[PDB]
Amino acid sequence: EIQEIVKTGLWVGDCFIYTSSVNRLNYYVGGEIVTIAHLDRTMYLLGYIPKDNRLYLGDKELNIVSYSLLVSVLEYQTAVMRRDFSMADKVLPTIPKEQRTRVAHFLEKQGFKQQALTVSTDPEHRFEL
Amino acid sequence: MDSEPPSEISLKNDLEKGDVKSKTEALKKVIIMILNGEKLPGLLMTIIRFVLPLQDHTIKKLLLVFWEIVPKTTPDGRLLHEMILVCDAYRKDLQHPNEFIRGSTLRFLCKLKEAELLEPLMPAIRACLEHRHSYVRRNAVLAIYTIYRNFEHLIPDAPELIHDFLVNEKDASCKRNAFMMLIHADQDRALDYLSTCIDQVQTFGDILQLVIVELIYKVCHANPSERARFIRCIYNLLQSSSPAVKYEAAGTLVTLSSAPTAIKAAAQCYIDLIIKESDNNVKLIVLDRLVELKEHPAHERVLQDLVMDILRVLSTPDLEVRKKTLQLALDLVSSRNVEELVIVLKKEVIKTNNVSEHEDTDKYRQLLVRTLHSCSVRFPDMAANVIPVLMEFLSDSNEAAAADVLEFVREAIQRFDNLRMLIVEKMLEVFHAIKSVKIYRGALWILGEYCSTKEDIQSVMTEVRRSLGEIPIVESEIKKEAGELKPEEEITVGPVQKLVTEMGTYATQSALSSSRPTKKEEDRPPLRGFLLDGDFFVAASLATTLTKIALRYVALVQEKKKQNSFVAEAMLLMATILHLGKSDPVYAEAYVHVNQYDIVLDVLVVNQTSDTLQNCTLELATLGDLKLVEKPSPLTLAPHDFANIKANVKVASTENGIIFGNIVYDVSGAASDRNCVVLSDIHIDIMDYIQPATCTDAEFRQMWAEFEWENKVTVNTNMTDLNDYLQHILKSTNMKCLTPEKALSGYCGFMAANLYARSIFGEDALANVSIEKPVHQGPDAAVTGHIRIRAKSQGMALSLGDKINLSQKKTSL
Amino acid sequence: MVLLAAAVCTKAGKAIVSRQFVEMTRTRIEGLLAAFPKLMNTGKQHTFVETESVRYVYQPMEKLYMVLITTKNSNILEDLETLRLFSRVIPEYCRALEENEISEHCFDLIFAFDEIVALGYRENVNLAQIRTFTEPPINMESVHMKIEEKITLTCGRDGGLQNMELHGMIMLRISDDKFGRIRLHVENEDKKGVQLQTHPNVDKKLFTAESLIGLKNPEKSFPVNSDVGVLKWRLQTTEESFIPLTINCWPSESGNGCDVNIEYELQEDNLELNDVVITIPLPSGVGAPVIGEIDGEYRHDSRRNTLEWCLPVIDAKNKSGSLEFSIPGQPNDFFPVQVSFISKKNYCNIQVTKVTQVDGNSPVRFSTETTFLVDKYEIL
Hints:
The structure is cut from a larger assembly and holds chains A, B and C.
Chain A: E1 8-12, E2 15-19, E3 24-29, E4 32-38, E5 44-49, E6 54-58, E7 65-67, H1 71-82, H2 85-91, H3 97-110, H4 113-119, H5 123-128
Antiparallel strand pairs in A: 1-2, 2-3, 3-4, 5-6, 6-7
Helix pairs in contact in A: 1-2, 1-3, 3-4
Chain B: H1 8-15, H2 20-36, H3 44-51, H4 57-66, H5 91-94, H6 99-111, H7 118-121, H8 134-149, H9 168-174, H10 188-197, H11 203-212, H12 224-236, H13 250-255, H14 261-275, H15 305-310, H16 319-332, H17 338-348, H18 362-378, H19 381-394, H20 399-415, H21 424-428, H22 437-449, H23 457-465, H24 474-481, H25 496-507, H26 530-534, H27 546-550, H28 570-578, E1 587-595, E2 598-606, E3 617-620, E4 627-630, E5 642-650, E6 665-668, E7 676-679, H29 697-706, E8 712-715, H30 722-732, E9 736-737, E10 751-757, E11 765-771, E12 785-791, H31 797-802
Helix pairs in contact in B: 1-2, 2-4, 4-6, 6-8, 9-10, 11-12, 14-16, 17-18, 17-19, 18-19, 18-20, 19-20, 20-22, 22-24, 24-25
Chain C: E1 5-10, E2 14-20, H1 27-35, E3 48-51, E4 54-61, E5 64-70, H2 76-94, H3 99-104, H4 106-116, E6 117-118, E7 121-122, H5 127-133, E8 142-155, E9 164-175, E10 181-186, E11 203-205, E12 212-216, E13 220-223, E14 232-235, E15 246-253, E16 258-265, E17 273-281, E18 289-293, E19 297-301, E20 306-314, E21 318-323, E22 337-343, E23 352-357, E24 364-379
Helix pairs in contact in C: 2-4
């Protein structure tokens, strides 16, 4: 059961990307809820059109807004969920600063403090691990 | 009867009259005069007589009212007994079938901590043991607790009477309505019972259970009370880097600044903090959490930066919110402050792009050029951005608009040596339409330093040199400037050498060159031509000449410490500068004594006379800001009496209507014309009345400006520094030596103190004590100090002026 | 008090009507109300504003302020809520706020104030309420039984039993092959108190004489909680429980000082208890004690105001001490002495008479052990 409520949602693979009533775009992996991104306003998932390389959102308007799904983050975290911590580390060169620390914290929550230590950019997170 | 202290004779009459309304009104009038604090015992027998047994609630309620605010004091109609006229027939009142009279009676009776009513209040819990309302049961737990408080911490108040004696507190927990007067010192079993009650709550009652016993294992269980404790409990379980995202704190918090812009400004601050925790350099201060709203994905839709743009402000919302917002742009994003300040400054500073950011008032324009430019001086990357934007500033092409632009950029070149070669050609352009000083000054400096780069210069300079506008300060700036950089690298009909010729003529010489200069006579008296005239050893060439000076920057020039800088964005700074950050014969003999830190005025009162002075009373008075902490109290001053009587003294009070002199001391005795005489004990001054307060350099400076302090005296025995005599004496005329206004060196080094006080005289008091202690071969007057003084109409200025000399008193009786 | 006063003000520069719950703020009430409510309580159109170190809560009505003042606070919601209820009650009496009409109904308002907030604690009121007032390995086969019990006692100096109760369980750890039926025989118990719990797999047998319990044990260790009393019960120490220790206290008035002799008695001499401590309390004006004891160590401890005697193991034994006291007050009643102890028997008197196992040959009851521990054991 997932913490952030699903106002609307979409399945990208077996991973569920949904909007939340917090305006949070989160994805469900593992039975764990991660925030892929923050929505600034209230948005609904029209669908994911591979052509545009985008997820198409709409406001109150019958027009288009687009969010590309942050696949590198999602794949890092998904791999972590599966208990493929090394695999998620291959993703890490393309996870930036603070995101490596976060993804590391994901890795850690699932378990393996050390692999999380190598990816975490932040020294403090390394130091605690 | 709002407050009328003499009316007690009419009240007695009104109190019994055979008309119930009149009696009620009378008793009511007594209540209102006592509450204010006025005369009441005369009435007592009358008051007490009608009301006593009756179940008729209104008079009874009124009398019941008067027994909790003065019962002890009033004694005509009551006197002292165990079953007083407060409670004797109010045992009937307690035992009436109507809940209101019983309940009321119980409630006042048990409320008193009176010992002359201790017994009657104890079985007074009977009146509310049966609970006809929520009010009756609450009234009971509070009354048992009040009985417990009133000398019954043991077995008189603890068990049950027939249902409560300290057990309503237990009962309440399981009953339909709760309220626990059990906060301290009461039954353990009830405390335990309240815990059980957290679940089976009554919400008002829950706030009573909760003050006693807090922290839950749950999320909640319901109701505002539990909810209010809960945010406290949450802050515990995550203290770390503020709350960050405010919990249930948010609801009270808005009202905390209802006046009206300040809430948004505050809210904006939290929202900025929350975004991210950055590097936290100089004005990069965003705390809270590192990731919780990120910054800056390239797939995030419609992005974080949209909210970040609000914070970049010209005033885009209103001024209070503006000042907060500019700091807040700087705080989330920059390198320090420099990066986001350049962007922000680019928007604010004057252009040809938008005319909603340009203005024809010269100082503001200039300041805005300096703010943009200070970012370069701070950080390199900004130099490259600044120079092209500066040329856009110029493109406005008003005399003045060019002018301001030229003035900063020229400073930037002093910092930024042969890096801004490119700008010179742009800078000349608007130099020809001219009505001001500033344009000439600045242009002549760019065109002058930059000569190697260009070759135009006779042509550009010459239209201006034979044009008019305002030219004082033009002279100074052109004087050091015109030749510079490379000896022969220009030519239009005047090479660099013609320029040195010109440069010299403009400074103070004479020469046909650029169709003569506009003026020659220099700016402010000290500057003159001569230094530069001597100079240009090697004709306008980088060596040890004007060029050197021009392509170098005076002292250290780095940061935003205000060394070729101006410290952020010019509009935000005005607000920061504003912020001061202020923090019958009678004989007396007397001395002041202190034992065990008790300060007392010793007085001895002497009757050297054989005559009668009986009727002798001694008083110390409250004059104004002087006060008695206890007058001398002996009934002494009798035939050939010597007595020592101690009058305790205070220095701090509020002004009384009687005289304002030294210390008044009053002895009374026999005599009927001068029953009271005023005679003196030793000196206390007018100066006491001043109240000490302090200033910082900003408050001192502001007040200096605010009102004149020209007035000076020189005070002897200011030979010494600030710290010694001068501080101690200044203290006694309630002043204090704070911050400096000095400028010390090997030739300078008068000690300077900035003084402040805020006198209870309708004035402040300020002064500067300058101590002329020789740090030169020719001192003012040697050791001594001149105190420059003021007060707000300089009526206390004078107090400062002489109370920094000397001051001492002693006696040895 | 948390609530100094509940006050209706006119910003004429005076407290129009006001209430002092208990004599404290008489004249004080008028000066506070007169200065602060004039400035809007120094507010800015905010319900809470604090000035001169006193919390003022208010509501403006005309040239008048209805004011609540506190200088302490128990909760956020509460302060507003009493003010609020007051604001339902005040127009019933005075038709909004207005100095002359407020003045005339001093009695009405004042009475409501006493009723609403009583001794500074915010009670509740209502307009109707106001009215009343103004009216396979079997070679291995072994079994072990462990009876762990705690006994509690309260006793008088006289040696009155008062109340007592034993709590315990008998755990069995058995290594037996196959599934063997076991029958347990124990003594018969009575209990003033109550409690008995039986493990599942416990059967009750009815016999003409004697009582029996039978069960297939789980292997390893488990709480037997057999039938009969059960092998998990609270029995009353009162019901036939032995109290391993009896303390006889003889206090004596040496005069200025006090001499206390404490007598300890144990059960059969052969049995020895361990971890025994006697806590003999002392009065507040202690001076110093001199204590003597044949066995163990005894030490006086101030703070605790108790003398503690500790004995590693005892067949049985006694102690004496002399106390020195300054004598303030009069004589003081004694507080009870408590003891901690361990005994290798159960004083619930549970005896395992016989546990016979079937489904196979004789197992060895390698050991039965009893651990007895003191609970709240108090004697005056």
